[PDB]
């Protein structure tokens with residue numbers, strides 16, 4: 354057994370990660386907790402398209418590198434997030450369409466991945482391409498309007514740019530196996546694997562709340578995607594009200610699935626969360642461990658004994 358999340362996860366060859374905000378790296382309580390508890394880091398916003406390429410071909414990795422450096426100097430690996438997404442595009446990219454956009458998408462992938470070549474264990478190459486609801490359709494965005502092949506092209510571009518990284522497709526509201534959105538993502542990944550499109554992993558954002566509750570069939574979802582020959586990862590976990598029960602169920606679902614690489618919770622303390630009003634994380638505002646922390650740690654350890662091995 355181990356006393357911190359990341360170390361406990363590593364006992365089963367997994368990671369327990371967080372989302373780090375560069376602006377919070379001067380907060381010693383934040384860095385003390387994050388450094389102690391997590392062995393994987395995702396930049397909360399610093400590696401997104403707007404932050405890394407604020408003007409066309411004018412890359413900026415200052416804040417991204419502050420997060421990367423903090424992570425590897427503190428022994429954590431890094432998940433890159435995210436290279437091609439409808440949201441958080443800089444204005445110059447939002448105004449592009451068709452072939453111009455396609456070239457800018459490929460150029461953006463190449464510039465960011467070249468900066469981090471060989472440094473990133475997993476990249477969220479494409480994020481949130483499916484529409485919400487029951488259509489199973491692709492979300493309408495400039496990227497989807499440039500051609501349905503944009504997702505496959507992003508993955509091929511990424512594989513060429515850095516063949517050492519695992520390349521993931523990431524989305525939300527795809528955790529419950531009965532949902533149409535889940536099945537659309539499953540059909541796409543299944544097609545990609547059939548044809549040899551370079552995709553190594555599927556990310557489940559895992560934002561559970563009253564509008565999209567956890568279901569025990571999340572384990573079925575994870576198993577079925579793993580059976581397509583891809584790894585699975587829980588990438589942006591947070592749970593409205595932070596019930597320790599549900600946090601432990603999610604943890605045990607990953608631990609039950611051999612290709613589930615690890616879990617990332619989407620921030621450190623509740624005050625750090627993008628949805629702080631839903632108090633959805635493992636640590637209180639004062640840095641203290643919540644009931645959910647204990648249940649997650651115990652799940653990772655397979656129990657809480659205090660005795661000789």
Ligand SMILES: *[C@H]1OC[C@@H](O[C@@H]2OC[C@@H](O)[C@H](O)[C@H]2O)[C@H](O)[C@H]1F
Nearest residue numbers: 397398434435480558589619626627
């Ligand atoms: C999964 O959901 C969380 C999202 O990160 C938020 O993006 C919007 C930004 O205002 C917040 O600070 C971030 O926490 C992440 O990119 C997405 F993939």
